[PDB]
Amino acid sequence: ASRGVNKVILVGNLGQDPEVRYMPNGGAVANITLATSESWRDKATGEMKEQTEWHRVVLFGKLAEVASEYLRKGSQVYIEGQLRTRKWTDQSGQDRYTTEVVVNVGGTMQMLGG
Amino acid sequence: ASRGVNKVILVGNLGQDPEVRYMPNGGAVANITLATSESWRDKATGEMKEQTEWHRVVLFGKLAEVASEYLRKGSQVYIEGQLRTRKWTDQSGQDRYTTEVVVNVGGTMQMLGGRQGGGA
Amino acid sequence: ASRGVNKVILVGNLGQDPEVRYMPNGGAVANITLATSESWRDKATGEMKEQTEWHRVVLFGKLAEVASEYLRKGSQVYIEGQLRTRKWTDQSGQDRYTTEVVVNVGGTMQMLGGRQ
Amino acid sequence: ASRGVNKVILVGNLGQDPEVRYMPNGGAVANITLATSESWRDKATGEMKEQTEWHRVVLFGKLAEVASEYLRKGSQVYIEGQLRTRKWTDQSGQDRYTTEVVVNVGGTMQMLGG
């Protein structure tokens, strides 16, 4: 063929309110940041030893809007976007961010969250 | 005591042979780079186009090894790892890479895929 | 292709309290039934129509227990088991049930309150 | 309280030709049967036993067609449908089949390369 399967699945809480914004063509684009966590106590020296990944998801169109009107910090959502590392040059050098992009092929859904 | 679900699923072809290591000379860590692709005929030229994401997957333990013994450039694998963006300071500033880490909760599997008969 | 990938992912609510069982082996086996839902509109025969699949998940070992101690009707869990249609002859004919089996390769996790 | 996430992911080989049908008036419906496998040696016998699940996937629209035109037996596909147990009364009693339904939210893709 010439395609493959690039899929990301997430169940997490927004760590910050939806970071909305618009662009050319007049685009709706939410930038929520999810946080998954995985703990595993045993053999160390003190207290606690948890780890929590922070995903940089990226919504578009409706979802973007939806996110904006109803998503809040603490909420718990299920994302089915896809990996998309994007290059951008900072105030000098080139930086790239891998973000969770939910475009059609996937979709957000929230739970009872908090 | 937080958890949630951080899962990545990939079906793709390695774009470069597998980068394998062993620490402590057995904590094997493979670093294969997958490539997924998504085309479409560009409408304004009518020509063919194709953007292709390159994922940086990371295998461990057995899979790492497995990858090493049987995973070659162009091979097609199914990974079920999880997202793990990790921070590292370059030769000056701080950089972070989001890699596909396959640790237990997931696992690699290859298809007959493309480009075989290695050792002509 | 020689082994393939059989994976099921679910986010749903138990429709009834668990159903723990202990087999000779000594293991515990929870049989919670999840319910996913998908509503939608039309123009043929219906209003805002909603159909809801009922998955028959199957837990083992710890999870089975966990489920038992803290899973009740209405809880919301994330299962990562695998499809497993199993044949069994009823009080006469042969019947087969496709159940969501979570064995190692996957795992349960609940939303809103947990092992806490 | 009217959703959740019901998703099935499969990478497998059709165990035989895709049963391709074109509904009463138009849209088709493919009925390919996937086969996943899981082996292991016997902790005593040493035999290389292997259990293999057979999924009953269901394609629609394009995919259905695609399947028909290019999915040959033995083909290896990736399905991203969702679980859908459906009730039907046999030539007497009530029977229910849990099938892998690929409707929009998912999609078929075959492997090959050679």
UniProtKB/Swiss-Prot annotation, chains A, D:
Keyword annotations: DNA damage, DNA recombination, DNA repair, DNA replication, DNA-binding
Listed name of the protein: Single-stranded DNA-binding protein
Keyword DNA damage: yes
DNA-binding residues (ranges): 54-60
GO terms under biological process: DNA recombination; DNA repair; DNA replication
GO cellular component terms attached to this protein's record: nucleoid
Full-protein interval shown: 2 to 115 of 178
Subunit structure: Homotetramer.
GO molecular function, one term: single-stranded DNA binding
Residue intervals of the SSB domain: 5-110
Keyword set includes Calcium: no
Role of this protein: Plays an important role in DNA replication, recombination and repair. Binds to ssDNA and to an array of partner proteins to recruit them to their sites of action during DNA metabolism.
